[PDB]
Design an enzyme around this catalytic site. Structure first.
Site, PDB file in Angstrom:
ATOM      1  N   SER A  73      79.445  -1.582  62.741  1.00 34.82           N
ATOM      2  CA  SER A  73      80.754  -0.816  62.961  1.00 34.82           C
ATOM      3  C   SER A  73      81.541  -1.314  64.330  1.00 34.82           C
ATOM      4  CB  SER A  73      80.105   0.788  63.285  1.00 34.82           C
ATOM      5  OG  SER A  73      79.924   0.745  64.619  1.00 34.82           O
ATOM      6  N   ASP A 114      84.081  -0.227  67.700  1.00 37.26           N
ATOM      7  CA  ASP A 114      84.671   0.752  68.431  1.00 37.26           C
ATOM      8  C   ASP A 114      86.090   0.329  68.869  1.00 37.26           C
ATOM      9  OD1 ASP A 114      82.224   2.053  68.906  1.00 37.26           O
ATOM     10  OD2 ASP A 114      81.605   0.475  70.207  1.00 37.26           O
ATOM     11  N   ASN A 136      79.614  -4.018  66.627  1.00 38.93           N
ATOM     12  CA  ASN A 136      78.317  -3.673  66.799  1.00 38.93           C
ATOM     13  C   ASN A 136      77.580  -4.270  65.667  1.00 38.93           C
ATOM     14  OD1 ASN A 136      78.279  -1.564  69.203  1.00 38.93           O
ATOM     15  ND2 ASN A 136      79.926  -0.766  67.657  1.00 38.93           N
ATOM     16  N   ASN A 149      84.512   4.964  67.149  1.00 44.10           N
ATOM     17  CA  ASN A 149      83.670   4.357  66.304  1.00 44.10           C
ATOM     18  C   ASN A 149      84.005   4.587  64.824  1.00 44.10           C
ATOM     19  OD1 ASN A 149      80.837   4.242  64.609  1.00 44.10           O
ATOM     20  ND2 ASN A 149      80.966   2.525  66.353  1.00 44.10           N
ATOM     21  N   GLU A 151      84.972   2.685  79.379  1.00 43.78           N
ATOM     22  CA  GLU A 151      84.758   2.463  77.915  1.00 43.78           C
ATOM     23  C   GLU A 151      85.867   1.182  77.618  1.00 43.78           C
ATOM     24  OE1 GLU A 151      83.183   3.493  75.555  1.00 43.78           O
ATOM     25  OE2 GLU A 151      82.221   5.346  76.066  1.00 43.78           O
ATOM     26  N   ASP A 203      74.962  -2.036  63.159  1.00 45.05           N
ATOM     27  CA  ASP A 203      75.363  -1.078  62.037  1.00 45.05           C
ATOM     28  C   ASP A 203      76.863  -1.646  61.166  1.00 45.05           C
ATOM     29  OD1 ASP A 203      77.189  -0.301  64.105  1.00 45.05           O
ATOM     30  OD2 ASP A 203      76.704   1.831  63.730  1.00 45.05           O
TER      31      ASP A 203
HETATM   32  C1  LIG Z   1      83.537   8.237  70.468  1.00 44.21           C
HETATM   33  C2  LIG Z   1      82.742   7.623  69.482  1.00 44.21           C
HETATM   34  O1  LIG Z   1      83.140   7.079  68.238  1.00 44.21           O
HETATM   35  N1  LIG Z   1      81.258   7.478  69.652  1.00 44.21           N
HETATM   36  C3  LIG Z   1      80.181   6.993  68.764  1.00 44.21           C
HETATM   37  C4  LIG Z   1      79.274   8.389  68.489  1.00 44.21           C
HETATM   38  O2  LIG Z   1      79.960   9.729  68.084  1.00 44.21           O
HETATM   39  C5  LIG Z   1      78.268   7.903  67.552  1.00 44.21           C
HETATM   40  O3  LIG Z   1      77.184   9.272  67.433  1.00 44.21           O
HETATM   41  C6  LIG Z   1      77.126   9.839  66.253  1.00 44.21           C
HETATM   42  O4  LIG Z   1      78.201  10.909  65.931  1.00 44.21           O
HETATM   43  C7  LIG Z   1      77.781  11.522  64.811  1.00 44.21           C
HETATM   44  C8  LIG Z   1      79.215  12.371  64.460  1.00 44.21           C
HETATM   45  O5  LIG Z   1      79.087  13.412  65.468  1.00 44.21           O
HETATM   46  C9  LIG Z   1      76.443  12.269  64.834  1.00 44.21           C
HETATM   47  O6  LIG Z   1      76.277  13.087  63.577  1.00 44.21           O
HETATM   48  C10 LIG Z   1      76.506  14.365  63.906  1.00 44.21           C
HETATM   49  O7  LIG Z   1      75.704  14.936  64.515  1.00 44.21           O
HETATM   50  C11 LIG Z   1      75.581  16.501  64.205  1.00 44.21           C
HETATM   51  C12 LIG Z   1      74.587  17.291  65.187  1.00 44.21           C
HETATM   52  O8  LIG Z   1      73.410  16.237  65.314  1.00 44.21           O
HETATM   53  C13 LIG Z   1      75.581  16.873  62.972  1.00 44.21           C
HETATM   54  O9  LIG Z   1      75.557  18.251  62.473  1.00 44.21           O
HETATM   55  C14 LIG Z   1      76.645  16.263  62.293  1.00 44.21           C
HETATM   56  O10 LIG Z   1      76.469  16.432  60.700  1.00 44.21           O
HETATM   57  C15 LIG Z   1      76.558  14.572  62.282  1.00 44.21           C
HETATM   58  N2  LIG Z   1      77.522  13.872  61.690  1.00 44.21           N
HETATM   59  C16 LIG Z   1      77.320  13.312  60.452  1.00 44.21           C
HETATM   60  C17 LIG Z   1      78.588  12.985  59.561  1.00 44.21           C
HETATM   61  O11 LIG Z   1      76.179  12.813  59.921  1.00 44.21           O
HETATM   62  C18 LIG Z   1      75.385  11.079  64.951  1.00 44.21           C
HETATM   63  O12 LIG Z   1      74.173  11.927  65.134  1.00 44.21           O
HETATM   64  C19 LIG Z   1      75.738  10.500  66.342  1.00 44.21           C
HETATM   65  N3  LIG Z   1      74.649   9.337  66.573  1.00 44.21           N
HETATM   66  C20 LIG Z   1      73.681   9.443  67.293  1.00 44.21           C
HETATM   67  C21 LIG Z   1      72.643   8.518  67.842  1.00 44.21           C
HETATM   68  O13 LIG Z   1      73.661  10.553  68.563  1.00 44.21           O
HETATM   69  C22 LIG Z   1      77.282   6.699  67.982  1.00 44.21           C
HETATM   70  C23 LIG Z   1      76.236   6.194  67.135  1.00 44.21           C
HETATM   71  O14 LIG Z   1      76.735   6.220  65.762  1.00 44.21           O
HETATM   72  O15 LIG Z   1      78.456   5.841  68.147  1.00 44.21           O
HETATM   73  C24 LIG Z   1      79.345   5.873  69.106  1.00 44.21           C
HETATM   74  O16 LIG Z   1      80.579   4.571  69.273  1.00 44.21           O
END
Ligand SMILES: CC(=O)N[C@@H]1[C@@H](O)[C@H](O[C@@H]2O[C@H](CO)[C@@H](O[C@@H]3O[C@H](CO)[C@@H](O)[C@H](O)[C@H]3NC(C)=O)[C@H](O)[C@H]2NC(C)=O)[C@@H](CO)O[C@H]1O
Length: 130
Positions: A51, A53, A46, A60, A35, A49
């Site tokens: 954002s 890391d 990125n 993120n 990472e 969006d």
């Molecule tokens: C280490 C790091 O920062 N990695 C980032 C990834 O975590 C990120 O993926 C997204 O994370 C969010 C939060 O966990 C996901 O939404 C969660 O999903 C669950 C189940 O689907 C849901 O119940 C939660 O409510 C929801 N959270 C919110 C606040 O909506 C989100 O789906 C993840 N995205 C994907 C594409 O899987 C990714 C992408 O943003 O970036 C990494 O840097």
């Protein structure tokens, strides 16, 4: 700062990483390696969006920390992204523990998925005495 492999392994173990939520230290070690290269000052913007890391674990700014420049930010760690750019990784480790508690777990880290998941990661902790 950039941690030396075993130095990091010992720090993570000392911070309760070894087996956290069932995830091994070697897995965490592989994750940090791919990472950020064990670099606490690593940041990746990125354009998609808008954002970024942050830190050694590349957490993120849209979902976990606040950097004040990311749209739709949630700040689940309730922490400024600046605390993820410190030589002392205690803050980063506490946020990482929160990140992994979400539904997709360690799969949140793309680099880990690409270079660590399903593969042998014993080497990352070899000879570290952990
Ligand atoms: C280490 C790091 O920062 N990695 C980032 C990834 O975590 C990120 O993926 C997204 O994370 C969010 C939060 O966990 C996901 O939404 C969660 O999903 C669950 C189940 O689907 C849901 O119940 C939660 O409510 C929801 N959270 C919110 C606040 O909506 C989100 O789906 C993840 N995205 C994907 C594409 O899987 C990714 C992408 O943003 O970036 C990494 O840097």
């Amino acid at each position: 700062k950039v941690f030396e492999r075993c130095e990091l392994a010992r720090t993570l173990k000392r911070l309760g990483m070894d087996g956290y939520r069932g995830i091994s230290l070697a897995n965490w070690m592989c994750l940090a390696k791919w990472e950020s290269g064990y670099n606490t000052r690593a940041t990746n913007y990125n354009a998609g969006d808008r954002s970024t890391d942050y830190g050694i674990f590349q957490i993120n700014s849209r979902y976990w920390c606040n950097d004040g420049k990311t749209p739709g930010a949630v700040n689940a760690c309730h922490l400024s992204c600046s605390a993820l750019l410190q030589d002392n990784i205690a803050d980063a480790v506490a946020c990482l523990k929160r990140v992994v508690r979400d539904p997709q777990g360690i799969r949140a880290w793309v680099a880990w998925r690409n270079r660590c998941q399903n593969r042998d990661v014993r080497q990352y902790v070899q000879g570290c005495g952990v």
